Ligand binder design. Sequence first.
Ligand SMILES: *[C@@H]1O[C@H](CO)[C@@H](O[C@@H]2O[C@H](CO)[C@@H](O[C@@H]3O[C@H](CO[C@H]4O[C@H](CO)[C@@H](O)[C@H](O)[C@@H]4O)[C@@H](O)[C@H](O[C@H]4O[C@H](CO)[C@@H](O)[C@H](O)[C@@H]4O)[C@@H]3O)[C@H](O)[C@H]2NC(C)=O)[C@H](O)[C@H]1NC(C)=O
Ligand SMILES: *[C@@H]1O[C@H](CO)[C@@H](O[C@@H]2O[C@H](CO)[C@@H](O)[C@H](O)[C@H]2NC(C)=O)[C@H](O)[C@H]1NC(C)=O
Ligand SMILES: *[C@@H]1O[C@H](CO)[C@@H](O)[C@H](O)[C@H]1NC(C)=O
Ligand SMILES: *[C@@H]1O[C@H](CO)[C@@H](O)[C@H](O)[C@H]1NC(C)=O
Lengths: 195, 49, 77, 49, 49
Amino acid sequence: SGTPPQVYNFKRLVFTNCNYNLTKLLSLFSVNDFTCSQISPAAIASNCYSSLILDYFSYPLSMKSDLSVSSAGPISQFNYKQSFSNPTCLILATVPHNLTTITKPLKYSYINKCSRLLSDDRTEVPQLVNANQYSPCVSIVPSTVWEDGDYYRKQLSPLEGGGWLVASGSTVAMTEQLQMGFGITVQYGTDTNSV
Amino acid sequence: AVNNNAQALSKLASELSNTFGAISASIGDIIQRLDPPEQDAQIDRLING
Amino acid sequence: VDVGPDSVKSACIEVDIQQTFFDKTWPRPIDVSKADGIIYPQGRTYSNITITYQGLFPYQGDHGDMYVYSAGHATGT
Amino acid sequence: YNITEDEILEWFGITQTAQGVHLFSSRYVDLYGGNMFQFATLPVYDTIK
Amino acid sequence: PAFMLGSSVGNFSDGKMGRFFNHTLVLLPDGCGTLLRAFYCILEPRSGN
Ligand SMILES: *[C@@H]1O[C@H](CO)[C@@H](O[C@@H]2O[C@H](CO)[C@@H](O[C@@H]3O[C@H](CO[C@H]4O[C@H](CO)[C@@H](O)[C@H](O)[C@@H]4O)[C@@H](O)[C@H](O[C@H]4O[C@H](CO)[C@@H](O)[C@H](O)[C@@H]4O)[C@@H]3O)[C@H](O)[C@H]2NC(C)=O)[C@H](O)[C@H]1NC(C)=O
Ligand SMILES: *[C@@H]1O[C@H](CO)[C@@H](O[C@@H]2O[C@H](CO)[C@@H](O)[C@H](O)[C@H]2NC(C)=O)[C@H](O)[C@H]1NC(C)=O
Ligand SMILES: *[C@@H]1O[C@H](CO)[C@@H](O)[C@H](O)[C@H]1NC(C)=O
Ligand SMILES: *[C@@H]1O[C@H](CO)[C@@H](O)[C@H](O)[C@H]1NC(C)=O
């Protein structure tokens, strides 16, 4: 339901004390690309866990090679991260033609740089967004980016370290059909084993 | 001497939970959660340890 | 996207400054031997065993961060 | 959440992990004792600073 | 006790410390210590006395 959000705006859903099945879900998914790291394709539809976390976002196939864990692209720099502490799965899918419940946003986008300067206007340090974490650039970058290289800026309070936070975003136009991406991470002992 | 024998046997009885960098300790769980070409490496790490 | 109406008009009740009365210290640092205020194991309980465990804890005997509430002024009722 | 009244030292704890916000207490399990036990799991979106 | 949490700090109209922006966790014990009203929500100031 609704419009999928940007890759730097990844919506997370957590599942606990319930039952799941991909065959009732993945059948209506036009899965373009299917990868899983530290886990088998059959495990996510067969094995039992303690809890599930699934992050979904809008993601085209143009920056497909940036799905790698060790990739250093801006998507893997200031937009989305993956946890080294748990096995992961990556899904790249497309809206089915006989599926109009979902909606399409204006354009794909991501953040090409996210670094913070200090009050002295001479020292600049990039911040590294952590695994399953959100950069402070998310707090100032809007949900959509109007055009490639859009610039955003904000003043930071001295109690928050002072200086300024600046960022720039880049855009990729829509294809014939909307493409989106999902990341799946499992948890085995983080609570009662019930899923 | 009795404690020496006890700790000598407890070295075996305790070490089986070690992973040696493998993602899990149970061999059945490794072959359940993984494809062959990487569970071979994980099992090999367990074998070496 | 939740529920809840709005309140009465813009008469926020006057808020005072009397921190000098609030500058009192009841000293109760924690005692890990007495075992007060410790996170349990998150998913697996144990029984009758001494276990080394990594987690999130406070230091021994931290004096703390003294805060307290009180009641407002009143002349009679 | 419903909480009854008492006069017993009540401990309470709040933390955040990548799973979400964890709220721990003693009013759910061990009243006359007192430790942490997860009574609430909250779907937080960003890390609290 | 009641606890309010966030990740963005600012100052009020008088410049005093305590103003936060965007979404904010608010935790409030309530009803003579019976309810534990919690919400990640949006705070909006008022401009009266
Ligand atoms: C003011 O007065 C006292 C302190 O001055 C406090 O209230 C009492 O505190 C004691 C603490 O020891 C409480 O005793 C505890 O009782 C538990 C069992 O109570 C249940 O079962 C009985 C029937 O057997 C019921 O009547 C009762 O209502 C409960 O349903 C025990 O399990 C506790 O044992 C714990 O400590 C011992 C060591 O002391 C351990 O060995 C145990 O494993 C366990 O950890 C404990 O003995 C007593 O219940 C409290 N009274 C009340 C009414 O709750 C308070 O500070 C305050 N009391 C007030 C305001 O009532
Ligand atoms: C919990 O562990 C302790 C220590 O291992 C046990 O205490 C010993 O119990 C045995 C038999 O029960 C006695 O022969 C020892 O003398 C005890 N040790 C001491 C120092 O007194 C205790 O019994 C265990 N409790 C349970 C329920 O298993
Ligand atoms: C947070 O509030 C500030 C206040 O102007 C605003 O500039 C900023 O865009 C907001 N951020 C989000 C993510 O809503
Ligand atoms: C708390 O108790 C009241 C009593 O009627 C009930 O209506 C309410 O649903 C209860 N809430 C919870 C969370 O148990």
